[PDB]
Symmetry: C4
Subunit: 271 residues, 4 copies
Amino acid sequence: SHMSRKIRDLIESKRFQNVITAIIVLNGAVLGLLTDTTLSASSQNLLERVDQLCLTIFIVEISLKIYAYGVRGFFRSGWNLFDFVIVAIALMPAQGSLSVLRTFRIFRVMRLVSVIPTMRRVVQGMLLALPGVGSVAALLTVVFYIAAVMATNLYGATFPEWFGDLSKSLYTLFQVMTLESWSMGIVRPVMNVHPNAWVFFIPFIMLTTLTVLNLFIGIIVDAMAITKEQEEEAKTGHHQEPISQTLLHLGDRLDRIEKQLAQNNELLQRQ
Amino acid sequence: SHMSRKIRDLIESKRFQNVITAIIVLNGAVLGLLTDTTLSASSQNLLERVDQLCLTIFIVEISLKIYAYGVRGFFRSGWNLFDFVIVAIALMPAQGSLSVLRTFRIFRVMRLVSVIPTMRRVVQGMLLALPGVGSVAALLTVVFYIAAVMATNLYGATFPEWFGDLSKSLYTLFQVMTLESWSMGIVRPVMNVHPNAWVFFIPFIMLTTLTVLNLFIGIIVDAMAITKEQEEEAKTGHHQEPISQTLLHLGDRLDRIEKQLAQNNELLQRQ
Amino acid sequence: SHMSRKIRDLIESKRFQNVITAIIVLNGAVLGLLTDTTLSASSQNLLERVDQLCLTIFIVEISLKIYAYGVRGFFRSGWNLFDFVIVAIALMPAQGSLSVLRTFRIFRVMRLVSVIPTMRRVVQGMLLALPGVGSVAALLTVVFYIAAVMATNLYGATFPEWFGDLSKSLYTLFQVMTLESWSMGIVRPVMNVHPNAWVFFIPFIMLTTLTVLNLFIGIIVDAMAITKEQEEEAKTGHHQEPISQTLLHLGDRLDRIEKQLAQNNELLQRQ
Amino acid sequence: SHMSRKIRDLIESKRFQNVITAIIVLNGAVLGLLTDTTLSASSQNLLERVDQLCLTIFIVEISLKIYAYGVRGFFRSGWNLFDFVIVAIALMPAQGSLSVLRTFRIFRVMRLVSVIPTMRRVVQGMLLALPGVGSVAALLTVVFYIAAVMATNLYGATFPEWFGDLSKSLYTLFQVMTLESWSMGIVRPVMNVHPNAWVFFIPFIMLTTLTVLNLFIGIIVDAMAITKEQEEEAKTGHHQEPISQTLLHLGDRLDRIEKQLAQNNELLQRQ
Ligand SMILES: CC/C(=C(/c1ccc(O)cc1)c1ccc(OCCNC)cc1)c1ccccc1
Ligand SMILES: CC/C(=C(/c1ccc(O)cc1)c1ccc(OCCNC)cc1)c1ccccc1
Ligand SMILES: CC/C(=C(/c1ccc(O)cc1)c1ccc(OCCNC)cc1)c1ccccc1
Ligand SMILES: CC/C(=C(/c1ccc(O)cc1)c1ccc(OCCNC)cc1)c1ccccc1
Ligand SMILES: CC/C(=C(\c1ccc(O)cc1)c1ccc(OCCNC)cc1)c1ccccc1
Ligand SMILES: CC/C(=C(\c1ccc(O)cc1)c1ccc(OCCNC)cc1)c1ccccc1
Ligand SMILES: CC/C(=C(\c1ccc(O)cc1)c1ccc(OCCNC)cc1)c1ccccc1
Ligand SMILES: CC/C(=C(\c1ccc(O)cc1)c1ccc(OCCNC)cc1)c1ccccc1
Ligand code: NA
Ligand code: NA
Ligand code: NA
């Protein structure tokens, strides 16, 4: 069909992307103005209608995309499903979920990420970098769980606001890890009752700050190489060898070329 | 002309650079002494005249440079325009701009950076490294904007000093990100009214600290390679291949040399 | 023997690993529920019996492993000795050691690390990375010891809570290093009595934060390469050349191939 | 001479190094015990004599080294001059310097670094890494000086404890940079009088934390490669090409080998 063809040409254009980006910024700005409690009844009603206009433009946009690519074709992309959910969640007459309320209309600004390709690639790098740090994130989870059970048993009876239960302990252990008032606010007061409390919190700080930094460095380094390798694949179209694989087999590739040079020289000297 | 030639020879000399560097340090030191409110009327007038002398030396310096290189030639360098603005801004009888006042004469010490070539190269590395982190900086901007709108709507009515409006929220979210009294000062008090506030601030901390570190690591790594590659171009004069490009095509260059070795060996065995 | 053979086949299976992992999570969860002081007598007795069941399953598991591999074969692995100690420590009718009490049954959750191979490899990377940072860790130890002796002599008489003895000084120096209330809580108050105290604490902060970061970066970078090289050895089975050795001899390997190319070209031109 | 020869053989032995290391630890431990104000007159006199014994052993050690290597030969090493000063400074009957007092006998423990070769190499890596970060350290110095002059002029009259003079401003700007109570303790109070103070402190934090991290990453990366390259030179004895030089010329070395392969193949096909 010619109708689905020219609609895709329109959707894939730079101006269409710019119009949709402009509407996201406009929706974002109206939601920001609506945080102002002093605004008049007319000013609020006006901005709410501008929010309604922005929302309807997105319904036209998504419906135009579903028709032009097909239900299966549109939903083949994770970015499209995200775009679909962000907009479709607004058209909901009552929902039965384990969430508070959908008053967070501002999450629509997250579409700037999906609509801008350079920003889409950054998040892509970060998400693809997550599986590779799963074991470190799990190790940190185990350290926190063990630590929380210990802290609850040791300090909960004497310090109930900070360690009274497992939930309170997880919260103040996260605070200790971020180094936030860990000594003047938590451990110096706890040491006044339990003088050897530093045997618990100092190794806890040393271990968690090292593991967290490991988790962050792991993500930053992979995400940086993934984003870079994706660009070399979104230019040449050829598959890019992962930098780690190049580095692992570098020595192997060097001795093979060395040995092939000597045997070629061995046959060259005697002809 | 012989006048413009010998003036360039003088300007490009090591001693001329040292004289101008000495005057910048002297101007910087007099402005530092002038922060002392206890000083006598004579001492203040004296230092203000030494500041005036330093300023006039810079007017001679820039005018000497404009004549020796030509208006177009001088203004071709961004460092020269910066040097021009820093000095020309002082000779201003009233200005109509969206700024407070030009009492910040101390910004003249920033000329140490433009006048010292090693320091000029460091800032150059840092500035050239900025475009490459634009998408991460934009992602962090979007996270802050979404977060500020949420925090204003959720906590502004109960916590007006910290979240009363969009501006107050952006400020305390920047504080939370820097881990400054985030729990003892902000979130433990907010949890006394909103017990699930940690569902907001803990993921906000996790996401922003990771993104900020990504932004900083990105800048530090590029700036380091740019400064290094600039030096290999300011020695040999030959263009230096970016380290990333060397790394991306390393595997490709290795299999090409491997394949050329085997085909050469294939023709060598049968002659 | 056929009995020891089929028992090893069972132990090395994926389902056996999953059953033992399930029991660790179950034991971990019951120990977490037991931190709740409000629980009834029946609820506590019940969970204590579920803890007892979990413990006995581990005694069956280890005994099954000792028989199937032999005492020497089982104890050949450091992970097995760790698994043995974690379980065998529970079956102890009074012990004479320089420890408080074995109420930390929650340390049994650390078995998730030894039982899950990806998690076992992460800790392995981290432990093997420790010898290489021993000199930096020793340098930081020497800085802390010298600093503590100084701080005790200088500030102990005027500030006994923070510097009264060597132990109190080591503790507040660790706090200063983590940047926790170092100025508003410790150094601004100390400067009210000793105005040049900043000559001590600012260089102490500068030196220790740099050394700690060196210690952490050192561990993170090695552990990352060790874990990666271990995987290339737990796939191909061939020994992986350490990335540092590849990098050190890279220039050497390149000039050797360059020189062999020119001499081959020298003999090729004249035949 | 045979006397100077066998004395060098003794000095260069492992046991001699161990004896001197034992005496440093012993001296360090006695100085630590002497921080205890509760000690009796006899206990103090005893430890002071053990300190005196340790000091005399070092005088024998250095004098033995000066004779065995010669005045010029001994003083040729920077580590020896350091060892000489640390010991010779103790034998001083009154000194006229811009220092407080030589009560810091504990600085003798810094000899553990010079006496242990692995620890000596770590400090060597760190010291040799300093010239390369001189421009970044200078940039950070200029930012602090400009910032201190601004802060004194803007906030000194309203906030004299924190910004009353140039010295007070440098101190609280260093505190702000370390993120220590920067908002709850300094900027929220300053904003109550100067509402746009965040325009000053937020860009100051952003710029200084980035520059400091640049300074630290710069030192850690060079020191790590220097220590590594020094070891490859203290094993093979051959000069090690700096990793940066290997990386810069990697692309250049690859295209030269590529071009030499094609021209060799061009002559091989037609013989
Ligand atoms: C720190 C980055 C790094 C890595 C590397 C080391 C040896 C190789 O053969 C290939 C890659 C590296 C890079 C990324 C890694 O994973 C990131 C997320 N997993 C934690 C793991 C290792 C490295 C380490 C030392 C020298 C050169 C590169
Ligand atoms: C962390 C530096 C790094 C990089 C790299 C990875 C693969 C390549 O083919 C070329 C460069 C790298 C270096 C700088 C980068 O950009 C810095 C600013 N953008 C966020 C992005 C990636 C890297 C990652 C893993 C192993 C070796 C180098
Ligand atoms: C930061 C990692 C690194 C390293 C390197 C530098 C030169 C070499 O010939 C081989 C390895 C490196 C990697 C890990 C090191 O040890 C980690 C634990 N010891 C402190 C030490 C150095 C490096 C530094 C500069 C460029 C490329 C890699
Ligand atoms: C971060 C280390 C690094 C570096 C590098 C980049 C390109 C080269 O041709 C040679 C070395 C590097 C390593 C150390 C440097 O100096 C450390 C102290 N000066 C600030 C500067 C740059 C680098 C950056 C990107 C990819 C691979 C290595
Ligand atoms: C090259 C991109 C990449 C990886 C990479 C990124 C930066 C580096 O400096 C080195 C390796 C990568 C990241 C993590 C990996 O394993 C982590 C261990 N698994 C638990 C394996 C490969 C990768 C490869 C396949 C899938 C996802 C990421
Ligand atoms: C080699 C200098 C360089 C870059 C570089 C610096 C250090 C590395 O370890 C790897 C790459 C660089 C930096 C960032 C780049 O892309 C970031 C993604 N764009 C949003 C691409 C290249 C660069 C190249 C062209 C223009 C500006 C910087
Ligand atoms: C390759 C794994 C490895 C090392 C390594 C990891 C990551 C890198 O980027 C560069 C080197 C390593 C780590 C530390 C080493 O020496 C530190 C100085 N000794 C005090 C020597 C080698 C190693 C080698 C042998 C035993 C243990 C670790
Ligand atoms: C290889 C050791 C080295 C350097 C190095 C260390 C680690 C790397 O990843 C890349 C380079 C080094 C460090 C800093 C350099 O320049 C910084 C800019 N000068 C202001 C130049 C070279 C060096 C070289 C000569 C003297 C001192 C240090
Ligand atoms: Na901090
Ligand atoms: Na704090
Ligand atoms: Na803090």
